[PDB]
Amino acid sequence: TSVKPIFSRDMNEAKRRVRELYRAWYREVPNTVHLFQLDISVKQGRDKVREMFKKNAHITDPRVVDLLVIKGKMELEETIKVWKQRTHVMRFFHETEAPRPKDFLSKFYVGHDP
Amino acid sequence: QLITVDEKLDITTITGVPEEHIKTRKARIFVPARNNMQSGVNNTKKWKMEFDTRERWENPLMGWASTADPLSNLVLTFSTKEDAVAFAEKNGWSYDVEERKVPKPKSKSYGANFSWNKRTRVSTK
Amino acid sequence: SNLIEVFVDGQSVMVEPGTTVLQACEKVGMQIPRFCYHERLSVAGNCRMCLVEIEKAPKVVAACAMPVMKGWNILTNSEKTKKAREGVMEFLLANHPLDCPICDQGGECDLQDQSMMFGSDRSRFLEGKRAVEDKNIGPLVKTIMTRCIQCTRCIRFASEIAGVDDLGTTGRGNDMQVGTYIEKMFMSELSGNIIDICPVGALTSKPYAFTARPWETRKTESIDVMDAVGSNIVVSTRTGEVMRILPRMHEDINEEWISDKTRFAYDGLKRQRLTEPMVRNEKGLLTHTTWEDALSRVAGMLQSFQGNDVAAIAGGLVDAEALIALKDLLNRVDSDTLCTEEVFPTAGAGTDLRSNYLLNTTIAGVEEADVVLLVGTNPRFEAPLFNARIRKSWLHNDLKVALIGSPVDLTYRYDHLGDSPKILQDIASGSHPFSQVLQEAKKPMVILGSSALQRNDGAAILAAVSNIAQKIRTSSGVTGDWKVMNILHRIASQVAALDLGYKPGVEAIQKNPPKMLFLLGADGGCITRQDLPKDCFIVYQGHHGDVGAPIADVILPGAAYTEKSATYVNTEGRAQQTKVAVTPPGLAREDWKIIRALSEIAGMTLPYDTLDQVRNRLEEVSPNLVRYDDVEGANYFQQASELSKLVNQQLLADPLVPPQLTIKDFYMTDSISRASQTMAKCVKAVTE
Amino acid sequence: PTVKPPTARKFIWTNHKFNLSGTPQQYVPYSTTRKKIQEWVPPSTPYK
Amino acid sequence: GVRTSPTGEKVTHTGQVYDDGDYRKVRFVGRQKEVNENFAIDLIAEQPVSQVGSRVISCDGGGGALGHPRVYINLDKETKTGTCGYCGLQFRQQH
Amino acid sequence: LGLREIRIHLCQRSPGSQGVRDFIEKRYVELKKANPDLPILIRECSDVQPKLWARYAFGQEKNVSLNNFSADQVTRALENVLSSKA
Amino acid sequence: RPTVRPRNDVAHKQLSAFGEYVAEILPKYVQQVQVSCFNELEICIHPDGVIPVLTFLRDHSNAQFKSLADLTAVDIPTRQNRFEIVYNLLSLRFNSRIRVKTYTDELTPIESSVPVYKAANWYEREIWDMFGVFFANHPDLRRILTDYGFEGHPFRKDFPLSGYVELRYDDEVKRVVAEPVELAQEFRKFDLNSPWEAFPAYRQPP
Ligand code: SF4
Ligand code: SF4
Ligand code: FES
Ligand SMILES: [K+]
Ligand SMILES: [Zn+2]
Structure with missing residues (x-):
């Protein structure tokens, strides 16, 4: 159970990187909305950033956290340098996807999947 | 310099799989049954992991079998059930494990075909 | 101590005396090529594909038949062994027809595969080939006998496993022909297994002919529901369609065999299917509707009734998940009239003690018994694979089998004591001589058929049989923890329903006719509208429109056993x-989900939303129901036998007559097989 | 073909057709297999 | 052997035809249902039975290596003819 | 509103169910004669901790653990249920 | 024998001798050395030894493997360390090739070999992209072959052949959009393996 670390030696060090990444993303949204001429608001973009971070709040492995931060930095680089096009940024929002029903009855009516 | 990690290995967040195809799937870990049409046993050596079968429907244009299940063809191979279970656990799939069925040792005797007083005597060869 | 040392290519292996050379090789993971040898048949030694060199011995030995001697070194890969295999393969293919493209065996053919692995890569046969005329042995097995390689596997299976001596060889030499000589149909409940054991495409499935190739099929390991044996199967599917059923080896149940009903009734799943919810219209006719509408009508009636006014009947193919969902739903309106179609006497302990209604010795335990007493059953047609296990013990252990009931042909010779139920009393009292056989037996086995319990004196018969089983156990004539009393079931859903606390039979419904009736795949016709009030609201949930459906007010299309994990x-x-092989057709739905959906619409939502959650519920009711593949022993036969005596019923004078006296009765017994055109062809074949 | 005529066959088109795409004679694909599952037809008379 | 249905749609040699309420026949509106009218089942039936003087005959479909794999057909039964499994030609042992 | 069904779960061999096994061997028959039309579903399964389930009207359920109970405590738990009406 | 590939014993012996030579000089890192029947030499090493072993083979006077022919990964899910990292090297001086192999899992970084071979730059970016193996101290590690924002590592054995998402142009939003994959015809899985063993020489012990 002794392993080679990526960047962080423990969760406290790992969570510092997470906070630093969040600040970078938070400040980048207004530029992204303007640069990509998005029809979403700056608040929506920041609400989406928070949602992406929040879904990984249960991780307790510092190596997994490091990879998530590493991948998050790559995604931020693709956005700042405008390697992404508008389609790539807007894929986070699933605009053309119909609302998937959640409750048991709705899923029962449409098909067999749980 | 190494560090100490006690968390159960969980990589679900860094594999890119959509959440639906982790939580709602049931992996089946098993050794495939011998195809009864043949006597060869070489296809029963390894452990397999497959996922639950989902809807296939008829394509309106051609009648071809359409699917919306991205794991419909995924079948993984493992040396042992422990390797298969470990792979399933770290990927967040719930699983069922079926113990390997091995044909039991049989007692064969060509001479029994001609028994003097037992029912094993054969009427034809 | 007893084991002797041999060598397989220099690797030492310790084997028991009598082990053949072929079995010694398989101990180190080497499969010797074979054609005539089958480990479940008697040794033949005729194909010669298994010839192998023994070091320092000039002559190759038939590994399948030769007992291994101490100190032998078996060279499974020597040049002599390889040349022997090449030569035999060359002879096998010399007269074989160039049929692979049109032959259904192609792609899963042992001749093809062992030719690739062990034979040469070309021909030097410059002559014309043999051609043989085809035989007609019924509607299930197609014969293209020019492909036969005279391995005699089919002959040995028919004689030893099926107990039918109709197949043989006629003529001599190159003209030797496998067949029946006369025009004759090989109609046995195990006949279809010769398709599997025939190594070539000489014997092929007629219903399957030309429809698929092996490489394109998907294999779903599943379970059979055509009877209560629980044979393990493989469902072959392609592009969303079921294509055939194959045996799946299970040593303790079906070994590698299945009954013809298990094998060929699957085509009933493509006919007469319920694909949409239906409700009656103003004209009184069933008409398609949405799931929302159909369930709202059912929920409306369910909310207006309580207690004895709601009842349910489960049919023979219903799964445990649906069985407990329906029980939970009716319990939430305070109903306890959860009934099955198959009766079991509730007198005494009833279903309180599992040992009362189980085959306690287990199927594999028959191979340990030294006497079997069959009562009021025809196991050949009620449980073909169980009957095959009796024959196996009869053949190899010299088992003694006695029967009380009609003298049906069982494929083995037995002692017929008569069909009068009074014989049980005579045996129990020591008057009958066969009671002396039971006393001197170290491992007796008494098996009462569930079909006998469908009589009106079922409780008396069960009491009398239990009295016999108790006389032996109390007399210490048996050994340690050997269970003597057995019940042989014939309905797939019965034991799970009894475990969950259902009431066996529909007597409760006849006592208090309900106003709302749930027919959960109930197609036996045990309760008709003549037995219900004029305005009774009947809901049929099932997969086939057969008997129950045309009398219901609401139809809820459910899933068949090939379409659910149940x-x-x-x-x-x-x-x-089971596992899902294909999804249910049309708008049909998983049966437990229908009841879970209905409970929500009716305001009594059940506390499980997934298959695993409803299985956790099953564990609350009966922990053994989630111990898959395990046989949990049942005890307390002594307490059950005490409760069996305190109330006395009288045997009727009617002799014990099983519902299936001949093979014609075997083919259609449930709604899937009644819908199968293949089974209709079987029925026609044996009656005409 | 005036020196080496093709082999005559009963089934060979006697009238060659050029590319028919874009016209009413164009090919339209469709499934050539029959229906696989037969639905139960409820009785035409009343009895509930 | 082209036959038509009550709706008028041609029936293919595999028996395919859209039933009356099938929306899918909208694809043929303004266009056409491609149907091959040389039904192989009717064409092979027109071939005469070949009389031979032996119990066993071989068929390769004609044309040597341009035909099908060579198979041997047994002609011992007198109730029916021997049919090639590849090409459908029929044979009969004379006298 | 009262009782509808009793279920007893136990292991065939674990010592924790020894008291339940004694109860069945010695008391179930007498208990069954007193409550003839009450389902008392005994269901043995290997390596389960023993338990007593009671189902009342309209599908309400309660479960009492019998682990390491003596045959007497099993009787007491049985009586506590045969007179309760949850 | 016209149809059989001829053996080359001389090259087999030379490569075997050099394989021991490497193992003797770097015992700290070498775990296994083998020469295949078609005369290819493989050095299996602990992952800590990537830089020392590759540097030795590049620079040592009796090696001079100056050319990195290829660098790739293999996913073997049954292994605790599922990823096998393969370096294929060429020595022009001695007209020879050698293969260096190590291993890692999904969370353990491998040391970037760009300092030893500048060729490694893009190969390691491709390994990261397709397999998700992280290389430490890479000058610029990021996806190279997949779409921007692509989720997952396609060359892993548990990644489905057709992926999870597919693209189309949607007129309502006037752009290309990504949606869950649906196929008009499902890929048809074939079961090809014969139930009969083909190669006795490679049989595994029971
Ligand atoms: S039995 Fe096997 S070898 Fe013979 S024609 Fe059929 S596929 Fe070919
Ligand atoms: S028909 Fe098949 S099983 Fe019977 S002898 Fe011929 S090859 Fe063997
Ligand atoms: S397998 Fe031994 S002779 Fe046939
Ligand atoms: K066969
Ligand atoms: Zn021909």
């Missing part, structure tokens, strides 16, 4: 689960 408990009390 739990069935075989006659031993072993829980097994």
Whole structure:
């Protein structure tokens, strides 16, 4: 159970990187909305950033956290340098996807999947 | 310099799989049954992991079998059930494990075909 | 101590005396090529594909038949062994027809594969080939006998496993022909297994002919529900369609065989299917509607009734998940009239003690018994694979079998004591001589058929049989923890329903006719509208429109056993689960989900939303129901036998007559097989 | 073909057709297999 | 052997035809249902039975290596003819 | 509103169910004669901790653990249920 | 024998001798050395030894493997360390090739070999992209072959052949959009393996 670390030696060090990444993303949204001429608001973009971070709040492995931060930095680089096009940024929002029903009855009516 | 990690290995967040195809799937870990049409046993050596079968429907244009299940063809191979279970656990799939069925040792005797007083005597060869 | 040392290519292996050379090789993972040898048949030694060199011996030995001697070094890969295999393969293919493209065996053919692995890569046969005329042995097995390689596997299977001596060889030499000589049909409940054991495409499935190739099929390991044996199967599917059923080896149940009903009734799943919800219209006719509408009508009636006014009947193919969902739903309106179609006497302990209604010895235990007493049953047609296990013990252990009931042909010779139920009393009292056989037996086995319990004096028969089983056990004539009393079931859903606390039979419904009736795949016709009030609201949930559906007010299309992952408990009390091979057709839905959806619409939502959650519920009611493949022993036969005596019923004078006296009765017994055109062809074949 | 005529066959088109795409004679694909599952037809008379 | 249905749609040699309420026949509106009218089942039936003087005959479909794999057909039964499994030609042992 | 069904779960061999096994061997028959039309579903399964389930009207359920109970405590738990009406 | 590939014993012996030579000089890192029947030499090493072993083979006077022919990964899910990292090297001085192999899992970084071979830059970016193996101290590690924002590592054995998402132009939003994959015809899985063993020489012990 002794392993080679990526960047962080423990969760406290790992969570510092997470906070630093969040600040970078938070400040980048207004530029992204303007640069990509998005029809979403700056608040929506920041609400989406928070949602992406929040879904990984249960991780307790510092190596997994490091990879998530590493991948998050790559995604931020693709956005700042405008390697992404508008389609790539807007894929986070699933605009053309119909609302998937959640409750048991709705899923029962449409098909067999749980 | 190494560090100490006690968390159960969980990589679900860094594999890119959509959440639906982790939580709602049931992996089946098993050794495939011998195809009864043949006597060869070489296809029963390894452990397999497959996922639950989902809807296939008829394509309106051609009648071809359409699917919306991205794991419909995924079948993984493992040396042992422990390797298969470990792979399933770290990927967040719930699983069922079926113990390997091995044909039991049989007692064969060509001479029994001609028994003097037992029912094993054969009427034809 | 007893084991002797031999060598397989220099690797030492310790084997028991009598082990053949072929078995010694398989101990180190080497499969010797074979054609005539089959480990479940008697040794033949005729194909010669298994010839192998023994070091320092000039002559190759037939590994399948030759007993291994101490100190032998078996060279499974020597040049002499390889040349022997090449030569034999060359002879096998010399007269074989160039049929692979049109032959259904192609792609899963042992001749093809062993030719690739062990034979040469070309021909030097410059002559013309043999051609043989085809035989007609019925509507299930197609014969293209020019492909036969005279391995005699089919002959040995028919004689030893099926107990039918109709197949043989006629003529001599190159003209030797496998067949029946006369025009004659090989109609046995195990006949279809010769398709599997025939190594070539000489014997092929007629219904399957030309429809698929092996490489393109998907294999779904599943369980059979055509009877209560619980045979393990493989469902072959392609592009969303079921294509055939194959045996799946299970040593403790079906070995590698299945009955013809298990094998060929699947085509009933493509006919007469319920694909949409239906409700009656103003004209009184069933008409398609949405799930929302159909369930709202059912929920409306359910909310207006309580207690004895709601009842349910489960049919023979219903799974445990649906069985407990329906029980929970009716319990939430305070109903306890959860009934099955198959009767079981509730007198005494009833279903309180599992040992009362189980095959306690287990299927594999028959191979340990030294006497079997069959009462009021025809196991050949009620449980073909169980009957095959009796024959196996009869053949190899010299088992003694006695029967009380009609003198049906069982494929082996037995002692017929008569069909009068009074014989049980005579045996129990020591008057009958066969009671002396039971006393001197170290491992007796008494098996009462569930079909006998469908009589009106079922409780008396069960009491009398239990009295016999108790006389032996109390007399210490048996050994340690050997169970003597057995019940042989014939309905797939019965044991799970008894485990869950259902009431066996529809007597409760006849006592208090309900106003609302749930027919959960109930197609036996045990309760008709003549037995219900004029305005009774009947809901049929099932997969086939057969008997129950045309009298219901609401039809809810459910899933067949090939279309759901559902739990069935075989006659031993072993829980097994199917897997989804294809999804239910049309708008049909998983049966437990229908009841869970109905509960929500009716305001009594059940506390489980997934298959695993409803299986956790099954564990609350009966922990054994989630121990898949395990046989949980049942005890307390002594307490059950005490409760069996305190109330006395009288045997009727009617002799014990099983519902299936001949093969014609075997083919259609449930709604899937009644819908199968293949089974209709079988029925026509044996009656005409 | 005036020196080496093709082999005559009963089934060979006697009238060659050029590319028919874009016209009413164009090919339209469709499934050539029959229906696989037969639905139960409820009785035409009343009895509930 | 082209036959038509009550709706008028041609029936293919595999028996395919859209039933009356099938929306899918909208694809043929303004276009056409491609149907091959040389039904192989009717064409092979027109071939005469070949009389031979032996119990066993071989068929390769004609044309040597341009035909099908060579198979041997047994002609011992007198109730029916021997049919090639590849090409459908029929044979009969004379006298 | 009262009782509808009793279920007893136990292991065939674990010592924790020894008291339940004694109860069945010695008391179930007498208990069954007193409550003839009450389902008392005994269901043995290997390596389960023993338990007593009671189902009342309209599908309400309660479960009492019998682990390491003596045959007497099993009787007491049985009586506590045969007179309760949850 | 016209149809059989001829053996080359001389090259087999030379490569075997050099394989021991490497193992003797770097015992700290070498775990296994083998020469295949078609005369290819493989050095299996602990992952800590990537830089020392590759540097030795590049620079040592009796090696001079100056050319990195290829660098790739293999996913073997049954292994605790599922990823096998393969370096294929060429020595022009001695007209020879050698293969260096190590291993890692999904969370353990491998040391970037760009300092030893500048060729490694893009190969390691491709390994990261397709397999998700992280290389430490890479000058610029990021996806190279997949779409921007692509989720997952396609060359892993548990990644489905057709992926999870597919693209189309949607007129309502006037752009290309990504949606869950649906196929008009499902890929048809074939079961090809014969139930009969083909190669006795490679049989595994029971
Ligand atoms: S039995 Fe096997 S070898 Fe013979 S024609 Fe059929 S596929 Fe070919
Ligand atoms: S028909 Fe098949 S099983 Fe019977 S002898 Fe011929 S090859 Fe063997
Ligand atoms: S397998 Fe031994 S002679 Fe046939
Ligand atoms: K066969
Ligand atoms: Zn021909």
